[PDB]
Design a protein around this ligand. Structure first.
Ligand SMILES: *[C@@H]1O[C@H](CO[C@@H]2O[C@@H](C)[C@@H](O)[C@@H](O)[C@@H]2O)[C@@H](O[C@@H]2O[C@H](CO)[C@@H](O)[C@H](O)[C@H]2NC(C)=O)[C@H](O[C@@H]2O[C@@H](C)[C@@H](O)[C@@H](O)[C@@H]2O)[C@H]1NC(C)=O
Ligand SMILES: *[C@@H]1O[C@H](CO)[C@@H](O[C@@H]2O[C@H](CO)[C@@H](O)[C@H](O)[C@H]2NC(C)=O)[C@H](O)[C@H]1NC(C)=O
Ligand SMILES: *[C@@H]1O[C@H](CO)[C@@H](O)[C@H](O)[C@H]1NC(C)=O
Ligand SMILES: *[C@@H]1O[C@H](CO)[C@@H](O)[C@H](O)[C@H]1NC(C)=O
Ligand SMILES: *[C@@H]1O[C@H](CO)[C@@H](O)[C@H](O)[C@H]1NC(C)=O
Ligand SMILES: *[C@@H]1O[C@H](CO)[C@@H](O)[C@H](O)[C@H]1NC(C)=O
Ligand SMILES: *[C@@H]1O[C@H](CO)[C@@H](O)[C@H](O)[C@H]1NC(C)=O
Ligand SMILES: *[C@@H]1O[C@H](CO)[C@@H](O)[C@H](O)[C@H]1NC(C)=O
Lengths: 49, 49, 278
C-alpha cells in the first residue's frame, strides 16, 4: 500500500489505467496507444462521443 | 575442490559429486552441460571460467 | 526527410528453397555426442522462402531492383542475407509503422548499432545511403531516411563505435548473415550466424547452427517488418535525390517459422552439425 505517497487531498489523477481495449493483452505486453475506442457500430473520427 | 567427492553449489545449482578438469569447450552463452539423461555433468566455474 | 524512390523496374516476386538453414540452439545448455529432440519455432526443411534482390544493371531496359517491402511477422522470421558491400542496414518491426503504435528499429548507422523501441513515424520508403567521392575515392555515409519523428518510448541502446567500411566491392557475394527473430512473452529473441561462402545468385546449401545473439526486453506487438537497405550515390547516376541513386548488389531471403519438432545432433565438440525435421 502506498496511500501515504500516491494519494492527494484533492485527488491524485497522475495514475491511469487502460479501459475499453479491443482484445486482451498478451503476456508481458505493453499498450500505450491513446486511440479512441469504438464501442458501438458508429465509427469514430478521433473524437469522443 | 577438485578430484574429491564434495557437495557443490554452482550458481544456485546444488549437487554432490567429484569435480575434474574438463576438455569440453563451452560456448560463451552456455553455463551448464547435461548428458542424455538430462543430468548436469559439466559446469563452468563462475569465477575461474 | 521522407523521400520515395523512383525509376524502379517491376518484376514478379522470386521464391527459392531453404534446404536445412534456420536451425538455432534451443537453449544455453552444452550437449556433446548426443541426439536431442526439441519442439520449438523452427524454419521447416526445404521451405518456400521469398527472395528479394538489390541490383542496378544498366542498359536500354536493364533492371533496377531495390526491394524493401513490408512483410508479415506471423510467428518468427528467418532472414538470410548474401552480400559483399554491407547493403542491408537493418530492420523495423511493428504493427502499424507510424506514430500510433510503438515500433522496434534495429539499424547500423555505419558507426554504431542502434536498437530503439520508440514511437516512430516511419517513411513510406525508408533507407540509408553512402556517397562516393571521385577526389577521395572513398565512400562516406550521408543519408538516413528511416523515420520522420521519434516519440513516446522506453528502449534505447547504442553500440560501441566502429568503422564498417562502405566500399562498393565487386564480384561474388563474400558474406552470408543469418538471423532468427522471435517475439515471445514480450521478448525479442535474436539468433545470429555468419558464414564466408562464395557463390553468385542463390542461397548456399548447407548446415550452420545459429547461436543466440540478444534477448531484448521489448514488450510490443509485432505483426509486420520492413528491411532497411543502403543505396549508393556518386558523380554518376545523376538525379534529384529520388532517382539519382544506384543499388549495390545484394540479396536477402525471408522465411517463416512454425512450431516443429527437430532432432539435432551434437558432436563431440558441442556443435549442432545436423538436424532432422520430424
Ligand atoms: C505520449 O505522447 C504524448 C504527446 O507528446 C507530445 O506530442 C509528441 C508528438 C511530441 O511532440 C512530444 O514531445 C510532446 O510532448 C505525451 O503528452 C501528453 O499527450 C496528451 C495527449 O494524448 C496530453 O493530453 C497531455 O497533456 C500530454 N502531456 C504532456 C506532459 O505532454 C504523453 O505523455 C504522458 O501521457 C499523458 C496522458 C500525461 O499523463 C503526461 O503527463 C504523460 O507524461 C505520452 N505518453 C507516454 C510517454 O506514456
Ligand atoms: C497486434 O496487432 C495486430 C494488427 O495490428 C492485431 O490484429 C488486429 O486485430 C483487430 C481486432 O483486435 C482486427 O480488427 C484486425 O483485423 C487485426 N489485424 C491483423 C493484421 O491481424 C492484434 O489484435 C494485436 N494484438 C494485440 C494483443 O493487441
Ligand atoms: C573474479 O571473477 C573474474 C571472472 O570474471 C575472474 O577473472 C577473477 O579472477 C575473479 N577474482 C577473484 C579474486 O577471484
Ligand atoms: C511517398 O508515398 C506516400 C504514398 O502513400 C505519400 O503519402 C508520401 O508523402 C510520399 N513521400 C514523399 C512524397 O516524400
Ligand atoms: C512458392 O510460393 C509461390 C507462391 O506463393 C509459388 O508460385 C511457388 O511455386 C512456390 N515454390 C515452390 C517451390 O513450389
Ligand atoms: C547513428 O546514430 C548514433 C546515435 O544514434 C550516432 O552517434 C551516429 O553518429 C549516427 N551515425 C551517423 C549519423 O552516420
Ligand atoms: C574527403 O574526405 C574528407 C575527410 O575524410 C572530407 O572532409 C571531404 O569532404 C571529403 N571529400 C568530399 C568531396 O566530400
Ligand atoms: C573437434 O575439435 C577438435 C579439436 O579442436 C578437432 O580436432 C576436431 O576436428 C573437431 N571435430 C569436428 C567434427 O569438427
Amino acid at each position: 500500500n502506498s496511500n501515504n505517497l500516491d494519494s492527494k487531498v484533492g485527488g491524485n489523477y497522475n495514475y491511469l489505467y487502460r479501459l475499453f481495449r479491443k482484445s486482451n493483452l498478451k503476456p508481458f505486453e505493453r499498450d500505450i496507444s491513446t486511440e479512441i475506442y469504438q464501442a458501438g457500430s458508429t465509427p469514430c473520427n478521433g473524437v469522443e462521443g | 575442490v577438485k578430484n574429491k567427492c564434495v557437495n557443490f553449489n554452482f550458481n544456485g545449482l546444488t549437487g554432490t559429486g567429484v569435480l575434474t578438469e574438463s576438455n569440453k569447450k563451452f560456448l560463451p552463452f552456455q553455463q551448464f552441460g547435461r548428458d542424455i539423461a538430462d543430468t548436469t555433468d559439466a559446469v563452468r566455474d563462475p569465477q575461474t571460467l | 526527410q521522407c523521400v520515395n524512390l523512383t525509376t524502379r523496374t517491376q518484376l514478379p516476386p522470386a521464391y527459392t528453397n531453404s534446404f536445412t538453414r534456420g536451425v538455432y540452439y534451443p537453449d544455453k545448455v552444452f550437449r556433446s555426442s548426443v541426439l536431442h529432440s526439441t519442439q520449438d519455432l523452427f524454419l521447416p526443411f526445404f521451405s518456400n522462402v521469398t527472395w528479394f534482390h538489390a541490383i542496378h544493371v544498366s542498359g536500354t531496359n536493364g533492371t533496377k531492383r531495390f526491394d524493401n517491402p513490408v512483410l508479415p511477422f506471423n510467428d518468427g522470421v528467418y532472414f538470410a542475407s548474401t552480400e559483399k558491400s554491407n547493403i542491408i542496414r537493418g530492420w523495423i518491426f511493428g504493427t502499424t509503422l507510424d506514430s500510433k503504435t510503438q515500433s522496434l528499429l534495429i539499424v547500423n548507422n555505419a558507426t554504431n548499432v542502434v536498437i530503439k523501441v520508440c514511437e516512430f513515424q516511419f517513411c513510406n520508403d525508408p533507407f540509408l545511403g553512402v556517397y562516393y567521392h571521385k577526389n577521395n575515392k572513398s565512400w562516406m555515409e550521408s543519408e538516413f531516411r528511416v523515420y520522420s519523428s521519434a516519440n513516446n518510448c522506453t528502449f534505447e541502446y547504442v553500440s560501441q563505435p566502429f568503422l564498417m567500411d562502405l566500399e562498393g566491392k565487386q564480384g561474388n557475394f563474400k558474406n552470408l548473415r543469418e538471423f532468427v527473430f522471435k517475439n515471445i512473452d514480450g521478448y525479442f529473441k535474436i539468433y545470429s550466424k555468419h558464414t564466408p561462402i562464395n557463390l553468385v545468385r542463390d542461397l548456399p546449401q548447407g548446415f550452420s547452427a545459429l547461436e543466440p545473439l540478444v534477448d531484448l526486453p521489448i514488450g510490443i506487438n509485432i505483426t509486420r517488418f520492413q528491411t532497411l537497405l543502403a543505396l549508393h550515390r556518386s558523380y554518376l547516376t545523376p538525379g534529384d535525390s529520388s532517382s539519382g541513386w544506384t543499388a549495390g548488389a545484394a540479396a536477402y531471403y525471408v522465411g517463416y517459422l512454425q512450431p516443429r519438432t527437430f532432432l539435432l545432433k551434437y558432436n563431440e565438440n558441442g556443435t549442432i552439425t545436423d538436424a532432422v525435421d520430424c
